[PDB]
């Protein structure tokens, strides 16, 4: 719940190792976990808040000019000077024009000339940085098992809104009864700050990395402005017209807000009005789950005469939900839910609500479960067999495995070696795979990066051809490995 229809959702099986399960979760998706007991929790990530930023840089985007002084010496005696070249607030440039008696001076040469202009600034880029503290991730962890009002509605108080910061720890959270859950986040292995720059324009903000933002044109100014206006650039902005021979002139280059946006394509955007409201990015929890009842075992198989009040409602490969309305004298009991096959009973499904439970009286409790890939009879009644429902999950086994392989390829994509940490309880194989892909993606790190969609797929096809030319069985670690990783990376990036 709070997790239905938000597809790309991260099913997690297994709790072994005692209780610890490694989960990598991000703003876009959410994670549903399972175990043989200890009922299914839902991990949705919501807003990140970096509390205390520090302003590192001001770029001017629109500028205007005034007071427009200029001067010229004489033909080759004197190179011109001007007293308002003294301020660096003025922009200045030397050039050479021509001079003669017509101009008045004498000696008929190509004499030097200066021009000067006062530099005033319009609205700016207010680029800031944040340390890898003063930032909190807010995670709503919410349980299944009933409580209508909406298997969606992330707004609402059913799942606790627990904060976490790198100045914090094991993240103890409490729920109704059973839900003492401890979460050990590792936020420093997340976005890897001290390589980030939040970038605020007039209304919006973006998250761009640091070297690019330092390397960008559109005049420099450091964070100690106040009475600054000391812009140490302006060859990238204001341009000086020089016609054929005579007097040169100043030209404001105009607002580069559109060119700025075209520059920061391929970068995630962010609302930043109230301090900060940082979004899309991932983090890595280790999850410990001892401390968990099943919201009572402590009950009976119920009497009977249930009633559906909602449809069949298939979501996203198998997860189907059914909202039943108990009728009778329950004194709240369990719900005898089963997913069976046909006659000569071969009961084969799974229930992801584990131990669903009726509330006090009439209240439309709802149940999600996964049938197999074909025919299925979902049954809920007992003594007069009360209610069966037919259902046909279209599916496949092979198609399900192939889609899971595509999910694993997308995890070999965007989220890095954290996606090797996305499983759990792996011991030897998972850890050695994470270390091997760590050093391997480090070699394919910076290290052949910085390239666009087109050039990546083109360098992929040329390197897969030179692998196809087949010398001495280097063609494998060439051609097939490199062609797979380049193509399945290039067609998936720039999202």
């Amino acid at each position, epitope marked *: 719940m709070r997790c239905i229809g938000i597809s790309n959702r991260d099913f997690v099986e297994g709790v072994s190792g005692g209780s610890w399960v490694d989960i990598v979760l991000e703003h876009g998706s959410c994670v549903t976990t399972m175990a043989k007991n200890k009922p299914t929790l839902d991990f949705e990530l919501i807003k990140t808040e970096a509390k*205390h930023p520090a302003t590192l840089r001001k770029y001017c985007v629109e500028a205007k000019l005034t007071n427009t002084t200029t001067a010229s010496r004489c033909p080759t005696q004197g190179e011109p000077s001007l007293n308002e070249e003294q301020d660096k607030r003025f922009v200045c440039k030397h050039s050479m024009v021509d001079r003669g008696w017509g101009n008045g001076c004498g000696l008929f040469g190509k004499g030097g000339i200066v021009t000067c202009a006062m530099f005033t600034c319009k609205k700016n880029m207010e680029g800031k940085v944040v340390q890898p503290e003063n930032l909190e991730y807010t995670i709503v962890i919410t349980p299944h098992s009933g409580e209508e009002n909406a298997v969606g509605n992330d707004t609402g108080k059913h799942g606790k809104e627990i904060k976490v910061t790198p100045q914090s720890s094991i993240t103890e959270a409490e729920l109704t009864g059973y839900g003492t859950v401890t979460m050990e986040c590792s936020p420093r292995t997340g976005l890897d700050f001290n390589e980030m720059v939040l970038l605020q324009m007039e209304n919006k903000a973006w998250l761009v990395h640091r070297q690019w933002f330092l390397d960008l044109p559109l005049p420099w100014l450091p964070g*100690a402005d*106040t*009475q*600054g*206006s000391n812009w140490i650039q302006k060859e990238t902005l204001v341009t000086f017209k020089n016609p054929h021979a005579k007097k040169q002139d100043v030209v404001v280059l105009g607002s580069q807000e559109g060119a700025m946006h075209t520059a920061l394509t391929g970068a995630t955007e962010i609302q930043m009005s109230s301090g900060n409201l940082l979004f899309t990015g991932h983090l890595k929890c280790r999850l410990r789950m001892d401390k968990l009842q099943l919201k009572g075992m402590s009950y009976s198989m119920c009497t009977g005469k249930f009633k559906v009040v909602k449809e069949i409602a298939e979501t996203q490969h198998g997860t189907i939900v059914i909202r039943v309305q108990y009728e009778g004298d329950g004194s709240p009991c369990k719900i005898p839910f089963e997913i069976m096959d046909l006659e000569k009973r071969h009961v084969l499904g799974r229930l992801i609500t584990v131990n669903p439970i009726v509330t006090e009286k009439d209240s439309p409790v709802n149940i999600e479960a996964e049938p197999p890939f074909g025919d299925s009879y979902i049954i809920i009644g007992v003594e007069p067999g009360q209610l069966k429902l037919s259902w046909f999950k279209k599916g496949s086994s092979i198609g399900q495995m192939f889609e899971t392989t595509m999910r694993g390829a997308k995890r070999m994509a965007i989220l890095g070696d954290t996606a090797w940490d996305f499983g759990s309880l792996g011991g030897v194989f998972t850890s050695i795979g994470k270390a091997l892909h760590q050093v391997f993606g480090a070699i394919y790190g910076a290290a052949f990066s910085g390239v666009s969609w087109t050039m990546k797929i083109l360098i992929g096809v040329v390197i897969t051809w030179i692998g196809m030319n087949s010398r001495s069985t280097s063609l494998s670690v060439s051609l097939v490995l490199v062609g797979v990783v380049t193509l399945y990376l290039g067609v998936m990036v720039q999202a």
Partner: antibody
Amino acid sequence: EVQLVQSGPDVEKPGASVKVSCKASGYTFTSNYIHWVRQAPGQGLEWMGVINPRGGSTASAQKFQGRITMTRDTSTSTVYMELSSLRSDDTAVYYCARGGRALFYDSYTTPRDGGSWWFDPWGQGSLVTVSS
Amino acid sequence: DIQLTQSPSSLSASVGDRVTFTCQASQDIRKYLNWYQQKPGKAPKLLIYDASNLKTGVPSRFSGSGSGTDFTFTISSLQPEDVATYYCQQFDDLPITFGQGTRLQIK
């Protein structure tokens, strides 16, 4: 003793610039920052800006963007504030004190506090009136 | 920014009363707060630093408390030399902002 002394009250023209001094006594002049705070009579207090005596970096608030300048004299242990583009709203009482010092340079907040803003060492007050 | 609201704006009380002031911040200012008195047209004086600590030379009738955003200043026994305008002040994040003020009147 622990003491600061400011200059006398001044009256200037609109669009002019005014200079207010702040002389120190009783301590080592590069062991504290100096900060300038205004107060209009029909208003409470309002922060203008910050200078460091050791070295001489400055900063100021956004309401004084490009209107204020801060210098010093280490030999006389004195801090000068110069407010430019005077208008009628600038008629106020001016104040200058001492911050506990991140040794090198200004504007820090994480060393446990400044510790006053600004009434322990501060002085006697400079009234500035912008009129014709 | 960090809007700092000071409440109430003005009070009147008799000599010997206990009076409390409340300042609220729009952000977390966890301990960075200061309390000042100001005698009108005079040279004013610090009362409380770090929102909990007396300055040496200040009498013990003054106190302050509060952690998150809401802060309480307290005079235990009001005395006739304590008629002043009282200010609370944030120190955090440095567009340094004062409270509006709180005037006192002796009954």
